[PDB]
Design an enzyme around this catalytic site. Structure first.
Site, PDB file in Angstrom:
ATOM      1  N   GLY I  30       0.771  -1.228   0.000  1.00  0.00           N
ATOM      2  CA  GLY I  30       0.000   0.000   0.000  1.00  0.00           C
ATOM      3  C   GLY I  30       0.803   1.279   0.000  1.00  0.00           C
ATOM      4  N   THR I  31       0.094   2.385  -0.192  1.00  0.00           N
ATOM      5  CA  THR I  31       0.668   3.729  -0.201  1.00  0.00           C
ATOM      6  C   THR I  31       1.582   3.945   1.004  1.00  0.00           C
ATOM      7  OG1 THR I  31      -0.979   5.007  -1.478  1.00  0.00           O
ATOM      8  CG2 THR I  31       0.048   6.108   0.403  1.00  0.00           C
ATOM      9  N   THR I  32       2.504   4.892   0.891  1.00  0.00           N
ATOM     10  CA  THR I  32       3.394   5.173   2.006  1.00  0.00           C
ATOM     11  C   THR I  32       2.823   6.315   2.859  1.00  0.00           C
ATOM     12  OG1 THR I  32       5.576   6.202   2.509  1.00  0.00           O
ATOM     13  CG2 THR I  32       4.833   6.277   0.224  1.00  0.00           C
ATOM     14  N   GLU I  47       0.754   9.679   1.319  1.00  0.00           N
ATOM     15  CA  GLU I  47       0.749   9.775  -0.135  1.00  0.00           C
ATOM     16  C   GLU I  47      -0.658   9.426  -0.641  1.00  0.00           C
ATOM     17  OE1 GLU I  47       2.608   7.077  -3.860  1.00  0.00           O
ATOM     18  OE2 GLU I  47       3.306   6.787  -1.810  1.00  0.00           O
ATOM     19  N   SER I  75      -1.457   2.501   6.260  1.00  0.00           N
ATOM     20  CA  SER I  75      -1.092   1.965   4.957  1.00  0.00           C
ATOM     21  C   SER I  75      -1.636   0.546   4.845  1.00  0.00           C
ATOM     22  CB  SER I  75       0.432   1.928   4.816  1.00  0.00           C
ATOM     23  OG  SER I  75       1.009   3.203   5.029  1.00  0.00           O
TER      24      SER I  75
END
Lengths: 222, 244, 243, 204, 198, 250, 233, 196, 244
Positions: I30-32, I47, I75
């Site tokens: 997943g996104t940071t 993010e 995340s």
């Protein structure tokens, strides 16, 4: 009912009368109001008879099971906590008033519990319809640092005040001494100041006095 | 989830059979043989104690003959523990019936109830069935002497003489061979002992390896009497019938 | 069949693999700890390892204060350790409430052990991969050390150690006691007992410690507390001036 | 209104020399209307005897209940229950209904089959045990019974004597109570045997 | 209340039950049959609270019939009354008890003897030569306490009833509109359709 | 959440076996040996205190437990399962008996209760049988002294003497030789100590052995006086000392 | 692989996927296409109703949740019913208790949270339907895309279903154009029909086959079908 | 019953009489109405002894568990627990509790929870049947930031009056001093406070 | 054998819980997102991949608040993250209701901790597919935390998770060293914006949207608030500048 508890230099003693009543009629001229919650924790109860009896055995049962689980001697404070939380739960409907005493790994203790669940601590206590007669005596003779024998006297005297002065109490005096080092000693009928005098006549009936209509043997064996 | 470890104990085989029941019965087949023979003047229950030792206390022992009521008793074949669970609930049903009708529970009524409980574990709940088979020996003022048998399936039937546990096929043939309608308790007692004697997977048939009981209506009385023979009593009757 | 290795049921050999594997998890943190009994106190030492620089060192601990008198150190993952700690605290509070006196260390241990024994028999609850060492100065038994495992087993020790290098620490201690002939550290101050503890911890692990490599907990009459970086440093300096 | 006074009735028990006696009346009425002259109030489970006075429906229910419990007890214990034990069973069974009791006043009488000692006891409607050595009374004519007993009683009476005494106690008390009488049956109990006699009394 | 009488003679049991059904100031029906047949040889009469009366009767009827079919056997009168008592005894301590009193009369084919049971809404059961519920009992017990003999024939029994019913019509304040009589003997239950003038 | 294991974990195999019961027995077979001998005036149960470390305090670990003042139990198998069994047993002794009859349960019944508990862990949903075998010794007024063995299956039988665990077969044989219906409690205690020595590899003394008896009443262990009828518990655990004394006469 | 980790939602694959959820999403694709787009004054739902036979109807795909909110469905109809209904209650509750119209953004949070529950507990199955929610609340026009995974997103316009990729690219282009169709409904709609046709192929949007719904500033969410849309074909 | 809690310069003090009665009879004359819920958080109980004892016991339980997890609780938090119990069970309770604790940051704090179950933070608080008689006096003699000796006097005089007029009060006057210094128990006998 | 990875509460032979580990995979994918603890508060930033031009800018918010002083970012599986916050929110209300004072950060941490750990005990539930960074200011300081699907969590000076957790962590470690005295709320806000920009390289393919929030005893009065307008742009630029 008249029950008292008195602490002494090395322990505590509790006493109680032996009269039981239904209304104004004496049902039992000599019952035992002193109950064993555990070997060294005894309880004296007044109020609704069946209640003091049941509540006493229940907590006694749990205390025993708790003792086995923890591998330790029962503590008076535990019987006290269990008793009150149980009594409180029932909003006073379990009419049990008790004076719980005993010795355990932490010393000698004296407590009182009311049907609603409130508890008291003291060096001398009394409960029952004879409560005031006894307390009068205790408030007159109690002193700090009583010897076992002095305590037994004070207690025995307090219960007497009840027998003589209260109609709800009478007959004999039972005592139980719990000393910090020894075994608890129960003294059933430590005093019997009310022995019925010999009857003026005997009422044994001449056999055949009663008219019978039928007779027969009863089968007990299956 | 857990569906992964579920044995689904209550399902049908493609042949319309209940796996667990069949396997439970298979288990029962290795249990000490129990025999029930019903005569004109009473019923006889004999059972073989599976495994024993010199040190085993036979006096205080009981693993096959249990008293349910005063007029009903049972012979067990299977898991003793399972049997006791059912025995006790069986005992309660008897008492409820009594407290309700002020009359002792008719033998079949009690047998059906117990069998229904068994059938339950057969159709729902996902639990294993009871590994037990019973021979019920009772008496009631409607059918008099009765002998019944129930198994894991929850099915039950009545017999004149019957066996459960190990070597039932052999024992049944032997029984079907010497049973006669007009029999008598003492006759049945002997028939029973002989049958066990010829089907035992042991050397000899000694008293220490037995449990015996009879339900008679003792002439000098007029009521029913259940007798569960004591070690000594078994040893005697064993010699008399000629098995010493 | 082969599922006797996933859930808590017996294997043909009569074993419970899930419990055995649960034991395996107790070494996952690679930390060693030991407890010893003073004359009137109980001490527990445990390695403190903080790998990440982003971590707030003050939040990394495997030592817990269960009650005013009971201290418990865990060997195993932190989430399971915290689970066990919260339960232990809850259990101790209720005991006092219902019985009118502080729950004894051995009793809390037996209680926690019993709970663990349940995850051993009932399928749906998994055992906790942790070993619990309880300590205190019981008002009836004096200094006490009780430990429990995923098996539901529990016992009291004169002293004990747990972790990967558990065995070296144990034999070390065993020998010291075969020598002293007594079942405890004959010291008046807990400061010297803590020192003794840290000392034998070094001899057995063959490693030197800094004030931030250890974690110390002490149990005394009516109180169990943990030491600070500085409290320890002071202890380290003391053992430094003897060697 | 008062459940313990709808049907009426009395029960009394006494100890003698190696014997115990228990007696009751046969009345069962509804208020003033007398209905049955055959309603007995003493039952026995093995060698243990129980008398129940109070609300008829409860007297019956309790008997059926105790038959039930004693039966199972014997099947498990493999022996008949003793007076002392049964008394405890009665007590706990009653207190189990502490807040919706049975309106009964039970009396237990029997001889311990092992120690041969005579035993009698009484309880209130919620189960408090009243263990007396001499006599136990119960019923709508309990005051009268206490009076009779307290006077006519003396220790170690013999079976033939205890009988006379118990019968005179019951009989004369029942006659000062509008809700008791109409018959009566006395039980003389000894280790080996038990005799049951019906007394002849006023029918008013 | 309503009239519910029961009398056990030599070989039968006779039940007499009033026919009126009154609510308030009006007599709604004068041909009510305050009875239910529990089994071929067991009859039960009942009286009490307006709804509870029949509901209870029919409920008990259903159970006995179910027992009969399940076991293909007729429960003895003694057994049936024990069942009914237990029911009432459970009811008395329930949220809303059944306020119904009953008389159970049956012929025990096994003992070959008629039996009469009186059970009130509290679950108070008793077996008698003759019984009654309500105020009726206040006139009929002494009446029968006088004119009753165990060996009486069914016919003597019906005359005995007539004597009761006459006493009740004379002194009771209410007009119960006569009774319906039924006989329970070794041959089942039958109703005397001619009592309005026997 | 929620135990979704509502089905039996013990079922019948095509052969007729109940696997888990068997395996539980295997677990018991591995357990340290324990035994029990019945004399004419007492019963003795004993086992070995296999300390799992010289640092552990063997006392804080009793394998012999008092259930009622006249009944004691000992086992072989998985200690933890035993511990909780003793708890349940001690409690059921009250809930199902003392609280109803005002007296402790007779040995056979309490044993019957324990057996029930174990039977259920053989059929109830989502549980494994108990991995222990118990030896319960007690005394009651109408049945005298008795000795029972309870198995994971829930089955139980009365014994004159028997042994369970590691060297049960060997020990059972040694008992059959030395037992007789005239043994006095001391004779059995002796015999017990002998039989146990064969099953012990290392140290054999009052600290490596746990032995208790069901004999006479100990008014000295009652805790109070004043009630004639109350004479004291018949169950007594022998002290490390009392054992050694009998070991020198071994 | 997959075959061993797709037995139920409660299972994670070795890579971190929830196949059951993924298979659920696959039902959306097999579903007919629908499109939603909003200006600053309105929001429109243009959905292509699919028919079984030429004797069968073109199953309704637009549900109204409240005077100010509605949605279009692509996937299992029953599941859309369950979800729409739930939303209808949430809207209703908000009104009755707080006398406040439910924020479209919040309706999205409610849908996400409800879906998420069927993806972490044993026994349940994910919802097999995609939803496009449009509405006018206290902050203007709004458009939401709801995925069974539990992921809900707010967009200017979008589409889901089969070949939905056509309309989605078209709108990703027409963006600057329709986003300004303020004050003019017929234009936003036409702009929508021109997006939905970008995913046709099989046929052409007929009268009893096209379905449009709109909401905005002074337009209570309303649905047009048949003759009502004729003027848009 | 006559009870009070007064905050002063160095912390806070709790005082109470020692009489518990059932009617006109004094069941206990040496009662301790000053209950400890935490090391430095105590309370004054008035009303049903059974109720206040049970309430206190439960609170002590909650704060003990709170401490296990979140360290020492504020006096405000202790008050919130009493309040939560009293308010939530108002129909079945007859308890008037005064909560007093010593914080290092807040120094001394007093909260009063009357019958309703409402909470009130005050410089000082008085309660119990006897309290009615000293409303005037206390209002007139209380000053903020008094000294320990001054405060002990204020309480001693106030309670002596309450005990004087209210028959439900009497016995000895107990006090509890709560400061950074720790906990101090005080007691005053009749012969001393009666002649004040 | 194998299959130790198909049921959630199962222990593998080496003492692991594979299902939890697989959950981590979902997180790493997943996104940071990150968290920076400063001298009187904490900053959160994440993010937000711009999948398309259709995503209304600034709308689809991710950071969440608990009560009034707690900020949470995560995340992995977003829905799972919301679920955990809903719980935390109740968890907080319950605490406040009984103790009056708003829940201490550490106390709050364990609440989420215990709850997450709970989802690794039974096979009837799936572990959480998110790693969460949360914190705030309380009675004694600011606290930053990170929680793993395993339920494990610790206090951090700086923390990061998701696709670019390494770039981030790298940066964070620099900060920790180059600021032994403590960063400032204003500083951290920019620093954060940078670290997100850097850590965005491990996903440089898609365009993203920045999102920051903070809780500073001085800058926000101890309350959690989102960074908007000017202060946001100022930080966006501070990054845009050092990205080159």
């Amino acid at each position: 009912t008249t029950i008292v508890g008195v602490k002494f230099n090395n322990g505590v003693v509790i006493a109680a009368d032996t009269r039981s009543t239904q209304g104004p009629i004496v049902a039992d001229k000599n019952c035992a109001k002193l109950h064993r919650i555990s070997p060294k924790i005894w309880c004296a109860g007044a109020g609704t008879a069946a209640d003091t009896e049941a509540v006493t055995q229940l907590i006694g049962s749990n205390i025993e099971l708790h003792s086995l689980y923890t591998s330790r001697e029962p503590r008076v404070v535990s019987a006290l906590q269990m008793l009150k939380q149980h009594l409180f739960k029932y909003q006073g409907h379990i009419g049990a008033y008790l004076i719980v005493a005993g010795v355990d790994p932490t010393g000698s203790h004296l407590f009182s519990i009311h049907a609603h669940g409130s508890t008291d601590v003291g060096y001398y206590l009394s409960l029952g319809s004879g409560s005031l007669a006894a307390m009068a005596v205790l408030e007159s003779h109690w002193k700090q640092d009583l010897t076992k024998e002095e305590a037994i006297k004070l207690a025995s005297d307090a219960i007497q005040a009840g027998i003589w002065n209260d109609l709800g109490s009478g007959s004999n005096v039972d005592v139980c001494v719990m000393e910090i080092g020894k075994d608890a000693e129960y003294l059933r009928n430590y005093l019997t100041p009310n022995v019925r005098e010999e009857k003026q006549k005997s009422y044994k009936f001449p056999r055949g006095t009663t008219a019978v209509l039928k007779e027969s043997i009863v089968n007990i064996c299956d | 989830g857990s569906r992964r470890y579920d044995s689904r104990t209550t399902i049908f085989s493609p042949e319309g059979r209940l796996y667990q029941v069949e396997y439970a019965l298979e288990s029962i087949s290795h249990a000490g043989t129990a025999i029930g023979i019903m005569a004109s003047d009473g019923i006889v229950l004999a059972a073989e104690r599976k495994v024993t030792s010199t040190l085993l206390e036979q006096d205080t022992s009981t693993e096959k003959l249990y008293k349910l009521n005063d007029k009903i008793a049972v012979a067990v074949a299977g898991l003793t523990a399972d049997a006791e669970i059912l025995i006790n609930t069986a005992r309660i049903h008897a008492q409820n019936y009594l407290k309700t009708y002020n009359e002792d529970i008719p033998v079949e009524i009690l047998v059906r109830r117990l069998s229904d409980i068994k059938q339950g574990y057969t159709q729902h709940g996902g639990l294993r069935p009871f590994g037990v088979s019973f021979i019920y020996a009772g008496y009631d003022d409607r059918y008099g002497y009765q002998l019944y048998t129930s198994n894991p399936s929850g099915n039950y039937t009545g017999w004149k003489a019957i066996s459960v546990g190990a070597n039932t096929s052999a024992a049944q043939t032997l029984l079907q061979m010497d049973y006669k309608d007009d029999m008598k308790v003492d006759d049945a007692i002997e028939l029973a002992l002989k049958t066990l004697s010829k089907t035992t997977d042991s050397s000899a048939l000694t008293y220490d390896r037995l449990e015996f009981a009879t339900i008679r209506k003792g002439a000098n009385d007029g009521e029913v009497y259940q007798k569960i023979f004591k070690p000594q009593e078994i040893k005697d009757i064993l010699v008399k019938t000629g098995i010493t | 069949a082969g599922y006797d290795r996933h859930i808590t049921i017996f294997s043909p050999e009569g074993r419970l693999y899930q419990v055995e594997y649960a034991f395996k998890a107790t070494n996952q943190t690679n930390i060693n700890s030991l407890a010893v009994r003073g004359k009137d106190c109980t001490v527990v030492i445990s390695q403190k390892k903080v790998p990440d620089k982003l971590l707030d060192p003050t939040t990394v601990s495997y030592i817990f204060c269960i009650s005013r008198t009971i201290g418990m150190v865990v060997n195993g993952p932190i989430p399971d350790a915290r689970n066990a700690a919260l339960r232990a605290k809850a259990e101790a509070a209720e005991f006092r409430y219902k019985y009118g006196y502080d729950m004894p260390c051995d009793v809390l241990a037996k209680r926690m052990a019993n709970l663990s024994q349940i995850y051993t028999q009932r399928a749906y609850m998994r055992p906790l991969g942790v070993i619990l060492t309880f300590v205190s100065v019981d008002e009836e038994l004096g200094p006490s050390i009780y430990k429990t495992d995923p098996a539901g087993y529990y016992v009291g020790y004169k002293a004990t150690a747990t972790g990967p290098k558990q065995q070296e620490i144990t034999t070390n201690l065993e020998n010291h006691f075969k020598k002293s002939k007594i079942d405890h550290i004959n010291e008046e101050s807990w400061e010297k007992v803590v020192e003794f503890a840290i000392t034998h911890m070094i001899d057995a692990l063959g490693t030197e410690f800094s004030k931030n490599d250890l974690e110390v907990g002490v149990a005394t009459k009516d109180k169990f507390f943990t030491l600070s970086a500085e409290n320890i440093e002071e202890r380290l300096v003391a053992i430094a001036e003897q060697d | 209104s008062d459940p313990s006074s709808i049907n009426g009735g009395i029960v009394v028990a006494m100890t003698g020399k190696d014997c115990v006696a228990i007696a009751c009346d046969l009345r069962l009425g509804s208020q003033s209307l007398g209905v049955s002259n055959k309603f007995e109030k003493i039952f026995h489970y093995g060698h243990v005897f129980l008398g129940i006075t109070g609300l008829a429906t409860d007297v019956t229910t309790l008997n059926e209940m105790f038959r039930y419990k004693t039966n199972l007890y014997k099947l498990k214990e493999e022996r008949a229950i003793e007076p002392e034990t049964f008394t405890q069973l009665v007590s706990s069974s009653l207190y189990e209904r502490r807040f919706g009791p049975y309106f009964v006043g039970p009396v237990v009488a029997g001889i311990n089959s092992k120690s041969g000692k005579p035993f009698i006891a009484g309880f209130d409607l919620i189960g408090c045990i009243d263990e007396a050595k001499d006599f136990i009374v119960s019923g709508t004519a309990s005051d009268q019974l206490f009076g009779m007993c307290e006077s006519l009683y003396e220790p170690n009476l013999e079976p033939e004597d205890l009988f006379e005494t118990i019968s005179q106690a019951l009989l004369n008390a029942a006659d000062r109570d509008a809700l008791s009488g109409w018959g009566a049956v006395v039980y003389i109990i000894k280790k080996d045997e038990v005799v049951k006699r019906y007394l002849k009394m006023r029918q008013d | 209340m309503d009239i519910i009488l029961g009398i056990r003679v030599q070989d039968s049991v006779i039940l007499a039950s009033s026919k009126a059904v009154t609510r308030g100031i009006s007599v709604l029906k004068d041909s009510d049959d305050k009875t239910r047949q529990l089994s071929p040889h067991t009859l039960m009469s009942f009286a009490g609270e307006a709804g509870d009366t029949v509901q209870f009767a029919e409920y008990i009827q259903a159970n006995i019939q179910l027992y009969s079919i399940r076991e293909d056997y007729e429960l003895s009168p003694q057994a049936v009354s024990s069942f009914v008592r237990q029911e009432l005894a459970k009811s008395i301590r329930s949220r809303r008890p059944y306020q119904v009193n009953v008389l159970i009369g049956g012929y025990d084919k096994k003992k070959n003897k008629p039996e009469l049971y009186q059970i009130d809404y509290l679950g108070t059961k008793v077996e008698l030569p003759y019984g009654a519920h309500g105020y009726s009992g206040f006139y009929t017990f002494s009446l029968l306490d006088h004119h009753y003999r165990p060996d009486m024939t069914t016919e003597e029994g019906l005359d005995l009833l007539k004597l009761c019913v006459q006493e009740l019509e004379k002194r009771m304040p209410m007009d119960f509109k006569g009774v319906i009589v039924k006989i329970v003997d070794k041959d089942g239950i039958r109703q005397v359709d001619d009592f309005q003038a026997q | 959440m929620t135990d979704r294991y509502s089905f039996s974990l013990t079922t019948f195999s095509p052969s007729g076996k109940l696997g888990q019961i068997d395996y539980a027995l295997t677990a018991v077979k591995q357990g340290v040996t324990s035994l029990g001998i019945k004399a004419t005036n007492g019963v003795v149960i004993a086992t070995e205190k296999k300390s799992s470390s010289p640092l552990a305090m063997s006392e804080t670990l009793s394998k012999v437990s008092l259930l009622t003042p006249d009944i004691g139990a000992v086992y072989s198998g998985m200690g933890p399962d035993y511990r909780v069994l003793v708890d349940k047993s001690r409690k059921v002794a009250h809930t199902s008996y003392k609280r109803i009859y005002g007296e402790y349960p007779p040995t056979k019944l309490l044993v019957s209760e324990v057996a029930k508990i174990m039977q259920e862990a053989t059929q109830s949903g989502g549980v494994r049988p108990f991995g222990v075998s118990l030896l319960i010794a007690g005394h009651d007024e109408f049945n005298g002294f008795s000795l029972y063995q309870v198995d994971p299956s829930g089955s139980y039988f009365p014994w004159k003497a028997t042994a369970i665990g590691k060297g049960s077969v060997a020990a059972k044989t040694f008992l059959e030789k030395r037992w007789n219906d005239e043994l006095e409690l001391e004779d059995a205690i002796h015999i017990a100590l002998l039989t146990l020595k064969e099953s012990v590899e290392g140290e054999f003394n009052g600290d490596t052995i746990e032995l208790a008896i069901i004999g006479d009443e100990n008014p000295d262990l009652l805790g109070y006086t004043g009630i004639p009828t109350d004479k004291g518990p018949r169950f007594r655990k022998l002290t490390s000392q009392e054992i050694n004394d009998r070991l020198e006469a071994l | 692989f997959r075959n061993n980790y797709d037995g139920d939602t409660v299972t994670f694959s070795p890579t971190g996927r929830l196949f059951q959820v993924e298979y659920a999403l696959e039902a959306i694709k097999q579903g007919s296409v629908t499109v939603g787009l909003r200006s600053n004054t309105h929001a429109v739902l243009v959905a292509l109703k699919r028919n079984a036979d030429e004797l069968s109807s073109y199953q309704k795909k637009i549900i109204k949740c409240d005077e100010h909110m509605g949605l279009s469905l692509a996937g299992l109809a029953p599941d859309a019913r369950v979800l729409s209904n739930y939303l209808r209650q949430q809207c209703n509750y908000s009104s009755l208790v707080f006398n406040r119209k439910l924020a479209v953004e919040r309706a999205g949070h409610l849908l996400c949270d409800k879906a998420q529950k069927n993806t972490q507990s044993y026994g349940g199955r994910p919802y097999g339907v995609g939803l496009l929610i449009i509405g006018y609340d206290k902050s203007g026009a709004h458009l939401l895309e709801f995925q069974p995974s539990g992921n809900v997103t707010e967009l200017y316009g979008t589409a889901i279903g089969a070949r939905s990729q056509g309309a989605k690219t078209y709108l990703e282009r027409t963006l600057d154009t329709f986003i300004k169709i303020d004050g003019n409904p017929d234009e936003l709609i036409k702009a929508g029909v021109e997006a939905i046709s970008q995913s046709l192929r099989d046929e052409s949007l007929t009268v009893d086959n096209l379905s449009i719904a709109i909401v905005g500033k002074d337009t209570p969410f309303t649905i047009y079908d048949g003759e009502a849309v004729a003027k848009y074909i | 019953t006559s009870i009070m809690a007064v905050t002063f310069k160095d912390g806070v003090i709790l005082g109470a009489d020692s009489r518990t009665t059932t009617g006109a009879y004094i069941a206990n004359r040496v009662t301790d109405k000053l209950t400890r819920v935490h090391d430095k958080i105590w309370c004054c109980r008035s009303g049903s002894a059974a109720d206040t004892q049970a309430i206190a016991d439960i609170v002590q339980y909650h704060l003990e568990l709170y401490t296990s997890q979140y360290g020492t609780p504020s006096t405000e938090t202790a008050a919130s627990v009493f309040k939560e119990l009293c308010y939530e069970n108002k129909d079945n309770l007859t308890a008037g509790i005064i909560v007093a604790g010593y914080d290092d940051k807040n120094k001394g704090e007093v909260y009063t929870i009357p019958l309703g179950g409402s909470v009130h933070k005050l410089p000082y608080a008085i309660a119990g049947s006897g309290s009615t008689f000293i409303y005037g006096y206390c209002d007139k003699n209380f000053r903020e930031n008094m000294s320990k000796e001054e405060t002990v006097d204020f309480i001693k005089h106030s309670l002596s009056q309450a005990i004087k007029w209210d028959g439900s009060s009497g016995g000895v006057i107990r006090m509890v001093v709560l400061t950074a210094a720790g906990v101090e128990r005080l007691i005053f006998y009749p012969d001393e406070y009666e002649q004040l | 054998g194998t299959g130790y990875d198909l049921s959630n509460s199962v222990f593998s032979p080496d003492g692991r819980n594979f299902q939890v580990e697989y959950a981590v995979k979902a997180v790493e994918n997943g996104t940071t997102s990150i968290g920076i603890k400063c001298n009187d508060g904490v900053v959160f930033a994440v993010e937000k991949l711009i999948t398309s031009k259709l995503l209304v800018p600034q709308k689809n918010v991710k950071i969440q608040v608990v009560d009034r002083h707690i900020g949470c970012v995560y995340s992995g599986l977003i829905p799972d993250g919301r679920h955990l916050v809903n719980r935390g929110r109740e968890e907080a209300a319950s605490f406040k209701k009984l103790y009056k004072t708003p829940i201490p950060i550490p106390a709050f941490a364990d609440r989420l901790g215990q709850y997450v750990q709970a989802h690794t005990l039974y096979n009837s539930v799936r572990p959480f597919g998110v790693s969460t960074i949360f914190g705030g200011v309380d009675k004694n300081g600011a606290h930053l935390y990170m929680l793993e699907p395993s339920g494990s969590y610790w206090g951090y000076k700086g923390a990061a998770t998701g696709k670019g957790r390494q770039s981030a962590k790298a940066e964070l470690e620099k900060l920790v060293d180059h600021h032994p005295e403590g960063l400032s709320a204003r500083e951290a806000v920019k620093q954060a914006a940078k670290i997100i920009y850097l850590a965005h390289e491990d996903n440089k393919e898609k365009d993203f949207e920045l999102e920051i929030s903070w809780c500073s005893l001085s800058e926000t009065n101890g309350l959690h608030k989102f960074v908007k307008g000017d202060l946001l742009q100022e930080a966006i630029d501070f990054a845009q500048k050092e990205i080159n």
